[PDB]
């Protein structure tokens, strides 16, 4: 049967991913796919589920799924988790404390890195305050650290808030690109369906 299979292809197998500061969100519903093959896959170096069981995922049903995808550094995968602090968790992508879903990551050094450097994926380094869960910031306003307004002038305390991930084939795993897919599962009680 294939009345409506889950279009995880457009997310996991996407030809290009977003930068973490501008992470994408895909809404998934209607369908019905299996997560055993996902969890039993030898390609996902990270597969962490919170409040839910990855292999008992086939037994459960929900209302909605949010498929958040982006690219970060290797040693930043640990931030994609509830209750984390750091450059990514504070300024790029924040998971709530009551997060219900799975965090999936895999090494993408074969795709998102080229000789000389893949200086395309970006991240937010400066922000006046931390992000609320699932908040997205794409502003390029010159960050102000002094009392004087920057007014579009890159002066003393006035710098750009974004920087470039530079990925090369010889870099270490902690600095190699990793594509992340965050699946958020919604609420449901007494699944008789």
């Amino acid at each position: 049967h294939h009345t409506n299979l889950c279009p995880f292809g457009e997310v996991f197998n996407a030809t290009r991913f977003a930068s973490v500061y501008a992470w994408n969100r895909k809404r998934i519903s209607n369908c019905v796919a299996d997560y055993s093959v996902l969890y039993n896959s030898a390609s996902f170096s990270t597969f962490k589920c919170y409040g839910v069981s990855p292999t008992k995922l086939n037994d459960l049903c929900f209302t909605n799924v949010y498929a958040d995808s982006f690219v970060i550094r290797g040693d930043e995968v640990r931030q994609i988790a509830p209750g984390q602090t750091g450059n990514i968790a504070d300024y790029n992508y924040k998971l709530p404390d009551d997060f219900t879903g799975c965090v999936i990551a895999w090494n993408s050094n074969n795709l998102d890195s080229k000789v000389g450097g893949n200086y395309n994926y970006l991240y937010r380094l400066f922000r006046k305050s931390n992000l609320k869960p699932f908040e997205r910031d794409i502003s390029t306003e010159i960050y102000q650290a002094g009392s004087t307004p920057c007014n579009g002038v890159k002066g003393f305390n006035c710098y750009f808030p974004l920087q470039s991930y530079g990925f090369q084939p010889t870099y270490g795993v902690g600095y190699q690109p990793y594509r992340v897919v965050v699946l958020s599962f919604e609420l449901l009680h007494a699944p008789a369906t």
Partner: antibody, heavy 117, light 105 residues
Framework: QVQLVESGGGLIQPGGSLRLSCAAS????????MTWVRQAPGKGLEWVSL???????FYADSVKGRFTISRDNSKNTLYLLMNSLRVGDTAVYYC???????????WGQGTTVTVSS | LTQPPSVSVAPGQTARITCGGN??????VHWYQQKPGQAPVLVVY???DRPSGIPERFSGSNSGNTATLTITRIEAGDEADYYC??????????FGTGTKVTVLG
């Protein structure tokens, strides 16, 4: 304008407590990467702690659980609380505003902490 | 980070201070000057940038497993300790062991 005046150093018995200050001028502490860096008498530089503009704090392994970094926006001053001190912590402690990619430009004059009998 | 213990350069000549480590391509390099009894002063940031007001004698470079700070036309005013610091992880910083540039007198 542009000053990092430190204070609060001195001698303190082992296992004691001491709090360092870092009065800022022209630079706003609450909206900057503010760090503490200590230099043992005659050794290199060892980063100790930092505080994000968003409030996230991080510490080095040699001071985890014993030190605490804070700030006061009304007084515009960076603080560093130190508990359970030992002789290894005896150093000249500096405070500096961090720019991450652009390094640490402005440094304090540095206060000295001596932990002995 | 590994830095040489000390360099010795004739006055007017040029010094070169190395800073070595693993995977020195993605991460950037910063340099600091510490005169005796003084706080460190950022002299070179992001490998090769000189901040405002610092002489053109200083200059930086970085590739492979080695960064380099170049001080041209050395005077006695350059006698200090020079430290490198990487731009590695936004959760912690590490410094070099420092290098003493004795100007020969």
């Amino acid at each position: 304008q542009v000053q990092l005046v430190e204070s609060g150093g001195g001698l303190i018995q082992p296992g004691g407590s001491l709090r360092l200050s870092c009065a800022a001028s022209g630079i706003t502490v609450s909206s900057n990467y503010m760090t503490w860096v200590r230099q043992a008498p005659g050794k290199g530089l060892e980063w100790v702690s930092l505080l994000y503009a968003g409030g996230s704090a991080f510490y080095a392994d040699s001071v985890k659980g014993r030190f605490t970094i804070s700030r006061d926006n009304s007084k515009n001053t960076l603080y560093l609380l130190m508990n359970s001190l030992r002789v290894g912590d005896t150093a000249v402690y500096y405070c500096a505003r961090d720019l991450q990619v652009y390094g640490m430009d402005v440094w304090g004059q540095g206060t000295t902490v001596t932990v002995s009998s | 980070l590994t830095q040489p213990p000390s360099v010795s350069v004739a006055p007017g000549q040029t010094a070169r201070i190395t800073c070595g480590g693993n995977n020195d391509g993605a991460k950037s390099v910063h340099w600091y000057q510490q005169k005796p009894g003084q706080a460190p002063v950022l002299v070179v940031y992001d490998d090769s940038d000189r901040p405002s007001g610092i002489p053109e004698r200083f200059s930086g470079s970085n590739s492979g497993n080695t960064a380099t700070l170049t001080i041209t036309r050395i005077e006695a005013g350059d006698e200090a300790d020079y430290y490198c610091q990487v731009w590695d992880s936004s959760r912690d910083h590490v410094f070099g062991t420092g290098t003493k540039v004795t100007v020969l007198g």
